[PDB]
Design a binder for this molecule. Structure first.
Ligand code: SAH
Ligand code: NA
Lengths: 265, 265
């Protein structure tokens, strides 16, 4: 008679917590969505095998418009789980789903999992130094979203790092690369001309966090703009003022130009 | 020849990921540190039992001063694990440890786990709206730290939420409560008069994240300053202006007063 929101983690089926696995294994019905993010190292089958249950995948429409019609009814007489990539409530609108559950008289519980939001720690950038985050969305027709540019500007002025979630169109199997994000930012810079994002801007790229061998690279846009960072998902980070040790890690671990070791205090 | 940084997650021994557990079980040596944080929902014994490996606990000094002569030597000819609460490399100084590994000719890999940085998503507050984070430390002697007040001021001023970690004396097993943090902030407000933290400030308290029954409370300081939020650890958040959807979640899930739907939106 309950609903469990269970995160599956960053890259493969083993990124689920032990708590999440043991609970999922005992649920009567298991649903999931794979449109909010991409788990590049697993398949629905591998997940089903690990959990030992048939998994009904839902689309954004199924969830956003029919969650209370598809999932909640069953949670009133059974133990139901709703699986999602990463952490269920991070950079998704799934939190609001708990409100729907309450209104339907269904109790819900949240089982966390590793999230890209905290995985940024592997870049060596102090996580407390990150400021407001933003999403780089694909332009549509004549609509060209640019608010993420102002977020970088606001953070940079305060010496804070900017995390940039990248766009995803699961149904079209489109996953925005860090390269595409950099190209869009240069276009916005050309329009706004604020000196926020240029060829000399230092950026950090993290691809496939969660895998044992993620791609972690740091450098100037002019040099990374066309570099191959591997398969998606990717996130782009625009660091603010660096601490000496952040710079050292980027150089030693992310192959950044030794030049950044020298910081302008 | 390999060092694995493995996160133990948020609250109990089941918060480690499947990947983290399986890798730990295959390691010849397993070290752990519990000074950055403590798994309040479990014990060293239970973690040891789950992993099926003797766990050698390391102090802050063992790690910060002697990581290269305590952990790395063994990593040269064996597979070694270094367990930490939360997600590895979140603690400010841990990233640098990977530099030490490289310098020692030891390959290192990171196995992620849930971190409070992403788990706070359970408060219903959008992750992208969080700004710079900080820690509330106890005053002592002629030292009354209050920079965390400025962090709140700069974040709120830009409509951003402030995540506040509370002081902890690991060895003495003493946790600062949300109540104490609030009292301290009111004192800082009294000395700075910035109109940043007062009795009418809306705050959110998250205690025992990771647990299946966490305490999520939201309301004005005047009402929560003396409320019992249960056993530690406690996390305090001073939200910025709320999105109506954030407000509704706090009211419906965190028991916030209806008043926030008009006053803090
Ligand atoms: N393993 C991974 N590596 C790199 N970026 C990732 C990632 N997982 C998610 N992202 C980034 O975040 C976006 C999804 S946003 C949803 C995030 C998810 N709830 C979590 O907790 O991680 C992706 O488009 C990508 O830009
Ligand atoms: Na943050």
């Amino acid at each position: 008679m309950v609903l469990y929101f269970i995160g599956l983690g960053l890259y493969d089926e083993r990124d689920i917590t032990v708590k999440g696995l043991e609970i999922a294994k005992k649920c009567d019905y298991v649903f999931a969505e794979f449109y909010t993010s991409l788990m590049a190292g697993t398949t629905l089958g591998r997940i089903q095998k690990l959990i030992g249950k048939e998994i009904r995948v839902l689309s954004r429409e199924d969830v956003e418009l029919n969650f209370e019609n598809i999932v909640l009814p069953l949670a009133k007489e059974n133990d139901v789980a709703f699986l999602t990539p990463g952490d269920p409530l991070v950079a998704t609108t799934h939190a609001e789903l708990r409100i729907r559950a309450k209104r339907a008289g269904v109790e819900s519980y949240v089982i966390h999992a590793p999230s890209i939001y905290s995985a940024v720690g592997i870049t060596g950038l102090h996580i407390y130094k990150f400021g407001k985050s933003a999403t780089v969305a694909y332009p549509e027709g004549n609509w060209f979203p640019m608010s993420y540019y102002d977020v970088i500007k606001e953070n940079a002025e305060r010496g804070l790092h900017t995390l940039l979630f990248l766009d995803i169109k699961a149904e079209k199997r489109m996953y925005m690369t860090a390269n595409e994000a950099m190209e869009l930012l240069l276009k916005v810079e050309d329009m706004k001309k604020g000196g926020v994002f240029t060829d000399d801007t230092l950026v950090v790229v993290l691809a496939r966090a969660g895998s044992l061998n993620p791609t972690i690279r740091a450098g100037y846009v002019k040099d990374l703009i066309r570099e191959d960072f591997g398969d998606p998902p990717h996130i782009l980070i625009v660091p603010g003022k660096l601490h000496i040790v952040e710079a050292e890690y980027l150089v030693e671990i992310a192959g950044a130009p030794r030049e950044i070791l020298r910081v302008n205090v």
